[PDB]
Amino acid sequence: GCVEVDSETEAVYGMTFKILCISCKRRSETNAETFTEWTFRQKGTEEFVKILRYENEVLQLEEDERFEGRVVWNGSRGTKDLQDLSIFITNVTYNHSGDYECHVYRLLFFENYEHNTSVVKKIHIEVVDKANRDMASIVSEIMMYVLIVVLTIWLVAEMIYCYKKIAAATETA
Amino acid sequence: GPQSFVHFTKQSLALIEQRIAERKSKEPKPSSDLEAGKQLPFIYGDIPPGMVSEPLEDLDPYYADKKTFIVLNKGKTIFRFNATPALYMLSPFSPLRRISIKILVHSLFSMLIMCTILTNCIFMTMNNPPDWTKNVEYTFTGIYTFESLVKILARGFCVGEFTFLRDPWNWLDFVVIVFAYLTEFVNLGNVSALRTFRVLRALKTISVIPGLKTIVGALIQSVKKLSDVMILTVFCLSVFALIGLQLFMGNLKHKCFRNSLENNETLESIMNTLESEEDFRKYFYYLEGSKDALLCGFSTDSGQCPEGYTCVKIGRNPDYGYTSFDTFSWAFLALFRLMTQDYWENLYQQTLRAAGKTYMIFFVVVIFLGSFYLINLILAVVAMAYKEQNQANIEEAKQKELEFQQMLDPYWIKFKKCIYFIVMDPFVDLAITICIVLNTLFMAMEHHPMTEEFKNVLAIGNLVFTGIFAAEMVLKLIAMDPYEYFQVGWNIFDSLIVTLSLVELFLADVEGLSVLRSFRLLRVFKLAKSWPTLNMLIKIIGNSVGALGNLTLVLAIIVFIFAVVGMQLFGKSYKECVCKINDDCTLPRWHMNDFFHSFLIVFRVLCGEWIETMWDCMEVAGQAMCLIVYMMVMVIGNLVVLNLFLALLLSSFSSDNLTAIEEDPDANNLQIAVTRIKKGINYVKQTLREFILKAFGKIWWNIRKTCYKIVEHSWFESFIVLMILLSSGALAFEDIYIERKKTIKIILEYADKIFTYIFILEMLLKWIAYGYKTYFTNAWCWLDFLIVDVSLVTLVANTLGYSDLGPIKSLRTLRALRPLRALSRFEGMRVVVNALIGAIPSIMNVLLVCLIFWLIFSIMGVNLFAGKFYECINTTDGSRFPASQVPNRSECFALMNVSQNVRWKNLKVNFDNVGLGYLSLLQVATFKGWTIIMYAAVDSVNVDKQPKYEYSLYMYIYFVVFIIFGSFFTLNLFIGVIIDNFNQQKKKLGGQDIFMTEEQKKYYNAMKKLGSKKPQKPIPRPGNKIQGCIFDLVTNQAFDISIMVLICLNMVTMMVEKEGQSQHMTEVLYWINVVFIILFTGECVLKLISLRHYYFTVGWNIFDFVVVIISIVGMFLADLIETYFVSPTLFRVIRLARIGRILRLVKGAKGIRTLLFALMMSLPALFNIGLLLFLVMFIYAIFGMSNFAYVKKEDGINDMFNFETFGNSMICLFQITTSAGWDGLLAPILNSKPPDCDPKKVHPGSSVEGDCGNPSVGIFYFVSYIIISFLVVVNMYIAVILENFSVATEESTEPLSEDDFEMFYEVWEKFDPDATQFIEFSKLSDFAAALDPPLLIAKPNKVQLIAMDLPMVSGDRIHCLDILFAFTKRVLGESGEMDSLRSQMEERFMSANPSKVSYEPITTTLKRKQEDV
Amino acid sequence: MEVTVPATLNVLNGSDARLPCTFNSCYTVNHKQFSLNWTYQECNNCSEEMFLQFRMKIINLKLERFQDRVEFSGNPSKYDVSVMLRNVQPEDEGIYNCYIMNPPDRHRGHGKIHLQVLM
Ligand SMILES: CC(C)CCC[C@@H](C)[C@H]1CC[C@H]2[C@@H]3CC=C4C[C@@H](OC(=O)CCC(=O)O)CC[C@]4(C)[C@H]3CC[C@]12C
Ligand SMILES: NC(=O)OC[C@@H]1N=C(N)N2CCC(O)(O)[C@@]23N=C(N)N[C@@H]13
Ligand SMILES: *[C@@H]1O[C@H](CO)[C@@H](O)[C@H](O)[C@H]1NC(C)=O
Ligand SMILES: *[C@@H]1O[C@H](CO)[C@@H](O)[C@H](O)[C@H]1NC(C)=O
């Protein structure tokens, strides 16, 4: 089943990065004919330029040079009922930092009814020079060592105490 | 008077008259062995040949005065008549009456009536009969009228004590006659309703067939005892119906309505102008292929309308509108359906989808406390009534048999003999028994997709086995004389079977009974040396048609009656109003238009499925007529079924069978041969050994002591339990939405790392504390060891090396077992587990028998429906092609060539081999998935032929027979032995309860007493004049009874709330409720003024006081709720408070208070079971949500019910705990190959591939689950309820009279003036002679005074309390209260006299007298 | 379909003759699909002349042989399709037929009345 996950927000310079855009239908059993368009406002500017449009299983790329090459479809294949609209950058550069817009245009087909829907997803992408470990993993590892050591110490302390008491009471008689 | 034979003559009549005249001028029971209808006692010898069938004088002296005369049959039965001329016309000497009464008392007369009754029963089963049927029914009514005339003329009708109309059965007969004649002459419009009555001629079987009338009396008594339970059931259903109608009023009218509307149309106009499924599909959202619109909800945990639709409350309820909570009546119907668990899972799913998932709680409570508690209550009451009845009959039979005993106070013959030896040989029989097993195991290798050579192999093998068995049959017949041969039952059994085999080998073209050879292994029960389980089952089936043959017959009779009634009432309607229940305007699968289908419907109702067929009936024939007929079948039929089941259960599994056990003198060939061959094998073992041998530091002890302290302490244990709970929760957090929960993902990883470390530390500590011996000769420690081992393994591999690539990604799924570490930790679960383990050995012993029985049935099924379940369907529609377009499989393949999306597919669960035959039988036995298999069966044609509609119609017989022998008998045996095992465990441990801990027993003893305590304290009267009167008021019985009315009035006030009622009725019903609130508060205030402080002493007066407060705040709060805040969901749940005013109704009932008390006694045990069930469900949920989270969603698996989260999975699991719809969940798991599942489907947001299921895992999952659930919930709830119920209905014995102890003391002072509490033994002989009755002991006292074993203190002196105890124990006997009364009597004495030094006993009066003699 | 009519109806010349016809069809009468034809023949082997028909609405064909004396006198929703012949004349003697279809009920109903005109 479809699950809306959010994309990561930090790409390593020079490497490859996949931008996630997932939009599930409310009821999975229906039919649709989805198509998508992406726009991108580069950090330092205020306007969104269209970069790509993916309709009818053919991706037509805009005439932009920032994304000339360097980007390939990585969404749903050969369906026309497109639920994952993700794109993938190859050779990320600094110019690819800013806001992204994932316009999803869906046309649900019903009994006698045709509903033209639309959704928007905003993603913020920051290009760093080398990967940064997420604070969550760090503090978790740290606390997971702290707990181990404190348990061991508590146990050993209580053990030495009890053992002294036992050695005492042994030869008391 | 063995020669008391005197023709009732005119002289005798005159004598009787003068006797009566002399008695009436001056102004006991008859011997029950003399009464008419009995059999003539042998005490009188034979009849004089001139007296039989002739007016004789009455024998019983009780009638010797009254005007009677009895006549005796040539079968020695009694017929007591009246002497008055019938209708003042025919004296007992009128030749007419003479010859009539002669005819009446005759065996042939009865056999004739039985014959004609059965013939009429057969003729009633014709939907449309010809006219010569009119002639023969004229004959029938003629016969009935004639025999009724002989009765009325012989016996008498106007005058007497033994007359025609003086017996209800003749009432029935006369009713039949008059109905027949009146309808035959004058007729009305609804002639069918008239003719429906003539089925009572079938009821006349009860009257004519012997023994039945006693059975009907027994049933009516059983019902009479079912009085309080019905009231309790109605009351509970009513309470839950009020609750539901409060919560779910109008929810099932939710629908997804399209948003954009053209032509300036509104919802109102639309709903006013569209009345066809097509139009509703145009405007509302219908799931493809469904009949009702999809239900939606407003919350976040309810259904979801697709984009472009919105949820609105409009239209009609689902299921033609018969499923709702809109009015009280419909809510009551729905709850009754929930109680009997009839397709309740659909109601469950609908309600959860329209209201939200958090209302699962409602259904949890209802099912257990309603469905499970009431069935068992009904079970318990029926069982106790029956057990009492039977034991009464049997003790009376002992009394009668006691009374009876007191009344007694050439060369061919040469080789015949040589053959006898060979054919009896203790080895040939064993060989034949192994040959039988080989033959069945040979036949069991028969599967559908079978090469031809396999077929010839099987054919020649079957021929070989037929040869073997026929040869042995011939040998027996030639050694043993034919008569002696046909004497034994097994001989004729094997004879018939081998003869049928030969006959079909006779090319006679039967091809239907060759399967029946498979019935031959039942001979293995012979050599089973009364296998502790097998002979049990055979004697079950024997008792069914043998001892209890008069019950099965009644069941068959009533089923026939109901089938015919249903047909007569509803057949023509089913035919006419047909397009209302079927679009193609043809008859549905379950109709009532001919006898066979109506019978099948009735049978289906007894199995427990009555709601769908009932909905179809209510449309065609109206609601009221249909409801009444179904409810009578459901109530009466299930009553009789319960009776039959429990009868056998108790009769064949209780002290009865183990009592009067006789030894079998047959040296079984089994034991002989096994001893001989055991000696042979030990001999050859010994000679093989022979041939082989002839040819050829205190510190460490301190360490262990210390580790022992820490592991034993209590902080340590509690800490470990905390860690266990945390680890199990961590498991519960990992669903399919774990990707978006990032931080939690990483946290749970490191948390798993630390848990593993902790548990390894614990294990090491235990090792150093206990040691390897003590630790590894334990059972739980092995469990913890295994768990930590798999955890450590995966941890290691996950990090250093292979790092989760191989089957490690499958070993990782065994984390779901980590909660198993809780069983050992909690005592409440350890006791239940222990009991179940103790019961295990008897379970896997009836299991073998069950598998053998089902193996037979599955082989037969495989031979009947091997590869005949294939069909050529239109995948888009899902419909079978007409078998005139696509006749066979090649044609379907040609259509696949040309057209698209057609498929020659096959049922997932079929009979293609014995493996799936077992699965198929499991669905039939549980009635969950059975209908599809049954439809597939009655349509089969041949191996590669398109199925046709009801081509092989009578294959329904196959499933009917199985359900009876499998689904009904196997359940009997299982519940039978299991329940006995529990009774054997209790006795082992002292008769204590085997489901309670040691801390719960204390609680149990207290609440047992604190419940049932008769004596109370009267409340003093207040002093004041203005308070006196109020007190006189509130105490009267008048006052209490009146309040019981205002409670029922309040109940009916809640019952008239319906969906969409006028604003007026809302305001009125509001103001009425206010008045009721005023009145009960007033009652409370009056009680608190009459009883100044003693009001809070009574347990009930407190419960009223709470209800008063709660009801009031329910009024104010709800008012405040809606006005300055808004929350309808809360609004409703707070109005549930007013229900507490109805609960007070159980304060006056006495049966109900007793039945509920049995429940309160049972919570401690049911709570333990509830725990163990929950842990099992949790473990299954983790397995499910990690195996089945990506299945197709094809059926039973929906957007809301699936294994994607912990919420959803637990919801599904709770559903199938009652096995409801487990076939639906399994179905989408059994498809593992395209074009069913796509093994490379990508899911957005995850990395898992493919939505296929694993059939092997899939099957094991559900089959194991529904088994475990049956063993726990069904069989322990029955055990727990059964024990408490008995002790609940038990009273207490405390008959002591205070004046008797006073006289005991007042006489004691005459012998002990110094009040030393001691008396001399020489004076003991006169002390007992001065007491008044019942304490009086008549002289000689010395003979009884010694046998009481009175202890004696120093000085040949005796204490007072020992005399009181020895005197009290004789008048009361050896009762259970006697030692408890002795316990309190000594304790109060020890607290009053601390000088123990003077009470030491030296000897007893028996031992002292033994010293003297 | 059960259709209830009098097999023979005897009416005085000049009086009004109600030709009663009711039909026991379980399905509700949908005026958009219900069909009624009331025909008239002189003899069993003679030609039938349709004189009234309920196709969507009551259609009186105004046959010359009846002048304007035919009226509908029923209520289809109440399963009554009777007609009225005012001021009966001797030439009205003959056979009258009530044909009935009540979709989706499969079977067509037919009632036949022999009207006789008395002096
Ligand atoms: C005594 C035991 C052992 C057997 C009892 C059998 C009865 C339960 C059967 C036999 C006759 C049947 C009855 C035959 C006639 C009717 C009348 C029937 O009502 C109508 O026909 C109304 C017709 C109309 O109103 O035009 C309702 C079913 C009922 C009670 C049947 C209910 C089931 C009955 C009572
Ligand atoms: N088809 C079948 O197995 O018939 C039996 C009955 N009828 C249904 N429509 N069901 C839905 C699913 C189901 O399990 O099959 C069942 N649910 C219950 N409680 N019994 C079943
Ligand atoms: C409202 O309905 C009327 C029908 O009488 C129609 O003429 C009119 O155009 C509708 N108005 C709109 C805004 O659709
Ligand atoms: C048509 O069907 C047959 C199989 O029945 C197949 O062998 C043949 O190649 C098919 N031809 C076409 C037109 O697809």
mmCIF file of N, CA, C and O in Angstrom, chain B residues 273 275 575-580 584-586 619-620, chain C residues 2 24-28 30 32-33 104-107:
data_model
loop_
_atom_site.group_PDB
_atom_site.id
_atom_site.type_symbol
_atom_site.label_atom_id
_atom_site.label_comp_id
_atom_site.label_asym_id
_atom_site.label_seq_id
_atom_site.Cartn_x
_atom_site.Cartn_y
_atom_site.Cartn_z
ATOM 1 N N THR B 273 -36.288 12.099 -6.690
ATOM 2 C CA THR B 273 -36.593 11.682 -8.057
ATOM 3 C C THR B 273 -35.730 10.535 -8.574
ATOM 4 O O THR B 273 -35.505 10.451 -9.782
ATOM 5 N N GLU B 275 -35.152 6.164 -7.951
ATOM 6 C CA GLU B 275 -35.566 4.978 -7.214
ATOM 7 C C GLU B 275 -35.039 3.708 -7.865
ATOM 8 O O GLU B 275 -35.700 2.666 -7.851
ATOM 9 N N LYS B 575 -41.655 -17.919 -5.691
ATOM 10 C CA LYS B 575 -41.720 -18.022 -7.142
ATOM 11 C C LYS B 575 -42.176 -16.716 -7.769
ATOM 12 O O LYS B 575 -41.682 -16.316 -8.826
ATOM 13 N N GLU B 576 -43.128 -16.044 -7.138
ATOM 14 C CA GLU B 576 -43.730 -14.869 -7.750
ATOM 15 C C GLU B 576 -42.888 -13.624 -7.534
ATOM 16 O O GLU B 576 -42.402 -13.023 -8.494
ATOM 17 N N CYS B 577 -42.674 -13.231 -6.285
ATOM 18 C CA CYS B 577 -41.909 -12.025 -5.995
ATOM 19 C C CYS B 577 -40.470 -12.528 -6.036
ATOM 20 O O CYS B 577 -39.802 -12.652 -5.022
ATOM 21 N N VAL B 578 -39.951 -12.698 -7.214
ATOM 22 C CA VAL B 578 -38.625 -13.282 -7.322
ATOM 23 C C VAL B 578 -37.653 -12.197 -7.754
ATOM 24 O O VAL B 578 -36.519 -12.172 -7.263
ATOM 25 N N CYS B 579 -38.063 -11.277 -8.615
ATOM 26 C CA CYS B 579 -37.157 -10.246 -9.088
ATOM 27 C C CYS B 579 -36.815 -9.233 -8.012
ATOM 28 O O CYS B 579 -36.065 -8.295 -8.282
ATOM 29 N N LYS B 580 -37.337 -9.399 -6.802
ATOM 30 C CA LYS B 580 -36.960 -8.546 -5.689
ATOM 31 C C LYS B 580 -35.703 -9.013 -4.989
ATOM 32 O O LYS B 580 -35.099 -8.232 -4.253
ATOM 33 N N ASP B 584 -31.541 -11.438 -12.074
ATOM 34 C CA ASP B 584 -31.813 -12.239 -13.297
ATOM 35 C C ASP B 584 -33.202 -12.860 -13.268
ATOM 36 O O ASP B 584 -33.470 -13.627 -14.190
ATOM 37 N N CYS B 585 -34.006 -12.589 -12.239
ATOM 38 C CA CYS B 585 -35.353 -13.135 -12.159
ATOM 39 C C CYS B 585 -35.325 -14.652 -12.310
ATOM 40 O O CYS B 585 -36.058 -15.238 -13.104
ATOM 41 N N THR B 586 -34.436 -15.283 -11.549
ATOM 42 C CA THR B 586 -34.435 -16.720 -11.337
ATOM 43 C C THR B 586 -34.277 -16.984 -9.850
ATOM 44 O O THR B 586 -33.901 -16.103 -9.079
ATOM 45 N N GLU B 619 -38.396 -10.077 2.340
ATOM 46 C CA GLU B 619 -38.787 -9.358 1.130
ATOM 47 C C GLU B 619 -39.924 -9.980 0.350
ATOM 48 O O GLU B 619 -40.856 -9.286 -0.036
ATOM 49 N N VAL B 620 -39.852 -11.276 0.103
ATOM 50 C CA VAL B 620 -40.896 -11.981 -0.636
ATOM 51 C C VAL B 620 -42.219 -12.173 0.109
ATOM 52 O O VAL B 620 -43.275 -12.019 -0.489
ATOM 53 N N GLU C 2 -52.886 -13.313 -11.548
ATOM 54 C CA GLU C 2 -54.292 -13.477 -11.207
ATOM 55 C C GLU C 2 -55.032 -12.186 -11.524
ATOM 56 O O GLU C 2 -54.677 -11.116 -11.015
ATOM 57 N N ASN C 24 -53.810 -9.316 -8.959
ATOM 58 C CA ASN C 24 -52.938 -9.497 -7.802
ATOM 59 C C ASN C 24 -51.477 -9.558 -8.204
ATOM 60 O O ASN C 24 -50.894 -10.641 -8.289
ATOM 61 N N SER C 25 -50.884 -8.396 -8.460
ATOM 62 C CA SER C 25 -49.463 -8.362 -8.766
ATOM 63 C C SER C 25 -48.755 -7.804 -7.557
ATOM 64 O O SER C 25 -49.056 -6.698 -7.107
ATOM 65 N N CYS C 26 -47.778 -8.569 -7.018
ATOM 66 C CA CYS C 26 -47.049 -8.147 -5.829
ATOM 67 C C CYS C 26 -46.224 -6.877 -6.028
ATOM 68 O O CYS C 26 -46.166 -6.033 -5.133
ATOM 69 N N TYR C 27 -45.618 -6.731 -7.200
ATOM 70 C CA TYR C 27 -44.772 -5.566 -7.459
ATOM 71 C C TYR C 27 -45.579 -4.276 -7.479
ATOM 72 O O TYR C 27 -46.713 -4.253 -7.961
ATOM 73 N N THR C 28 -44.998 -3.203 -6.953
ATOM 74 C CA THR C 28 -45.682 -1.910 -6.940
ATOM 75 C C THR C 28 -45.933 -1.400 -8.353
ATOM 76 O O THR C 28 -45.116 -1.609 -9.253
ATOM 77 N N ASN C 30 -45.694 0.890 -11.181
ATOM 78 C CA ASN C 30 -44.906 2.029 -11.637
ATOM 79 C C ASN C 30 -45.611 2.618 -12.853
ATOM 80 O O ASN C 30 -45.639 1.994 -13.917
ATOM 81 N N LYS C 32 -44.751 4.691 -14.898
ATOM 82 C CA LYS C 32 -43.901 4.893 -16.069
ATOM 83 C C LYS C 32 -43.678 3.616 -16.866
ATOM 84 O O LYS C 32 -43.203 3.691 -18.009
ATOM 85 N N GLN C 33 -44.048 2.458 -16.316
ATOM 86 C CA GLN C 33 -43.862 1.179 -16.991
ATOM 87 C C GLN C 33 -45.128 0.344 -17.078
ATOM 88 O O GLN C 33 -45.207 -0.521 -17.959
ATOM 89 N N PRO C 104 -41.482 -5.182 -13.149
ATOM 90 C CA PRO C 104 -40.778 -6.295 -13.791
ATOM 91 C C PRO C 104 -41.462 -7.650 -13.612
ATOM 92 O O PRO C 104 -40.846 -8.674 -13.897
ATOM 93 N N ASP C 105 -42.712 -7.661 -13.149
ATOM 94 C CA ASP C 105 -43.463 -8.908 -13.097
ATOM 95 C C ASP C 105 -43.482 -9.522 -14.492
ATOM 96 O O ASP C 105 -43.801 -8.849 -15.476
ATOM 97 N N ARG C 106 -43.126 -10.804 -14.575
ATOM 98 C CA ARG C 106 -42.912 -11.420 -15.882
ATOM 99 C C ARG C 106 -44.223 -11.693 -16.607
ATOM 100 O O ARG C 106 -44.322 -11.470 -17.820
ATOM 101 N N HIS C 107 -45.239 -12.171 -15.895
ATOM 102 C CA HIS C 107 -46.436 -12.690 -16.543
ATOM 103 C C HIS C 107 -47.450 -11.587 -16.830
ATOM 104 O O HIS C 107 -47.689 -10.704 -16.000
#
